[PDB]
Design a protein around this ligand. Structure first.
Ligand SMILES: CCCOC(=O)NCCCC[C@H](N)C(=O)OP(=O)(O)OC[C@H]1O[C@@H](n2cnc3c(N)ncnc32)[C@H](O)[C@@H]1O
Ligand SMILES: CCCOC(=O)NCCCC[C@H](N)C(=O)OP(=O)(O)OC[C@H]1O[C@@H](n2cnc3c(N)ncnc32)[C@H](O)[C@@H]1O
Lengths: 255, 255
């Protein structure tokens, strides 16, 4: 009669945010399975684009159109970059590779490097952004160990908290994601969606800048793409938005 | 009078495939520096798109339009997948992470998984592709340790060597890359550009398939994006096309 907790989990896996007691487990499952196969069939026949890849392309067009240079830097970076970011023995939340490298847990390091180098060639202000894989050993989850970050930044003139909030606002209203900016330069703003942190943004300059050869004011923000997708598609668990073999655009692939 | 080998290397770094003795090093360098800054300035003012990111988007549109489903799977995969690919103690060319994972050296594993799972929901034939970071400890270089692979595959009907060659041909003529297919099912074709291997393609089925729960015929090919860019932009060294802090669209960032 009553579904076991295990059966309920199984059905939840097959449940979509938009689906709407009695009937036995096998029938409820057979029903959801047919719906999910049809969903996949519709995607394969029409769209064919992956949510994460498509979001990245949409975000890229948004920043490129607003004057930001598109950066693609290494994912495997020197461990020294992590120390240089002020993270000495969070240090174990780092995925290490070999003796001197690791999987970037964030984008700041390579972006700092580009800001410094580009300043010798580009007119002020320097505007850049990167979208790509970042890695952090996790606990909760909202928390993926493998995720995708969008980090944009501007250095030089126009680097005010007001301009930063304006970019964030246009960006999220563009994506159709509800949010609230919270704070109270050297400032740190938290872009929230309910209790979920969408982004921790900062208005420089900050003491860390010196360690990277940066001496100008700057503004920047980092957003996790899977979180945006989770909020956007009303996914209950963020793993439905992650690179995975278990879900395709939020649809279970275990059919 | 004569440039030292070190000065020549420096100038080569600043040299673009399209630039065309006497003058002293400092003057030759100052000349190249101004040109490179202008190049970067033109990119920042107009395009703003990264070569690698832009190629990925172009390849994606190409396969999506031809009926292939866009896949974004994990970059950090179980070490077991490598053994399962038939690579037992090349095994040390693998970047290991923690005790049970590694950085994917290729895309086949996750694509095999998707072919198996999608077959339970999608009509024949199943066509999918992925574009993303792959990692392999290297020696030569043509050889990056961090690169980007495009792997597409079709399973079920239509999986002939002829159809495979046709896709490869349309793809490369589309990108404007000269090539030659060489070979002699269970077939392996090498797509060459002069002496450079652009892709090692295969016509299944192959014995390995069974280990992945795949029992249908299939065709597939893997192309390294940095190599395509290298050939396309006539870069002398492939590192000019890689994710890097040292080059931006083939232009030195050490100005
Ligand atoms: C000049 C250049 C230097 O720029 C900076 O130094 N800082 C720019 C300000 C941007 C913040 C920085 N990129 C950052 O990493 O903030 P934080 O680490 O708290 O993470 C920001 C966002 O990444 C996402 N995120 C994090 N970990 C996860 C996870 N495990 N799963 C899913 N989503 C996640 C989430 O959106 C989180 O709010
Ligand atoms: C059903 C699914 C299973 O599909 C398959 O099992 N096989 C599909 C056939 C595709 C070949 C496979 N993806 C592969 O990896 O072939 P191979 O490892 O020789 O590499 C293919 C290409 O990757 C590129 N590549 C490699 N290593 C580098 C490097 N270090 N720097 C730069 N470029 C590089 C280069 O283009 C090379 O030819």
């Amino acid at each position: 009669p009553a579904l076991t907790k295990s059966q309920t989990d199984r059905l939840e896996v097959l449940l979509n945010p938009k689906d709407e007691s009695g009937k036995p487990f096998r029938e409820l499952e057979s029903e959801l399975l047919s719906r999910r196969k049809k969903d996949l069939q519709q995607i394969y026949a029409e769209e064919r684009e992956n949510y994460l890849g498509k979001l990245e392309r949409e975000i890229t067009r948004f920043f490129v159109d607003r004057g930001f240079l598109e950066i693609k830097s290494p994912i495997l970076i020197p461990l020294e970059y992590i120390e240089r970011m002020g993270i000495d023995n969070l240090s174990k939340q780092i995925f290490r590779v070999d003796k001197n490298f690791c999987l970037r847990p964030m984008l700041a390091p390579n972006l700092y490097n580009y800001l410094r180098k580009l300043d010798r060639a580009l007119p002020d202000p320097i505007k850049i952004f990167e979208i790509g894989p970042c890695y952090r050993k996790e606990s909760d989850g909202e928390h993926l160990e493998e995720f995708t970050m969008l980090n944009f930044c501007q250095m030089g003139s126009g680097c005010t908290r007001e301009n930063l909030e304006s970019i964030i606002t246009d960006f999220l209203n563009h994506l159709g994601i509800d949010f609230k900016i919270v704070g109270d330069y050297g400032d740190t703003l938290d872009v929230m969606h309910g209790d979920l942190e969408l982004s921790s943004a900062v208005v420089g300059p900050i003491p860390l800048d010196r360690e990277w050869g940066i001496d100008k004011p700057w503004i920047g923000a980092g957003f996790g793409l899977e979180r945006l997708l989770k909020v956007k598609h009303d996914f209950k668990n963020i793993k439905r938005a992650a690179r995975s073999g278990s879900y395709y655009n939020g649809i279970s692939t275990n059919l």
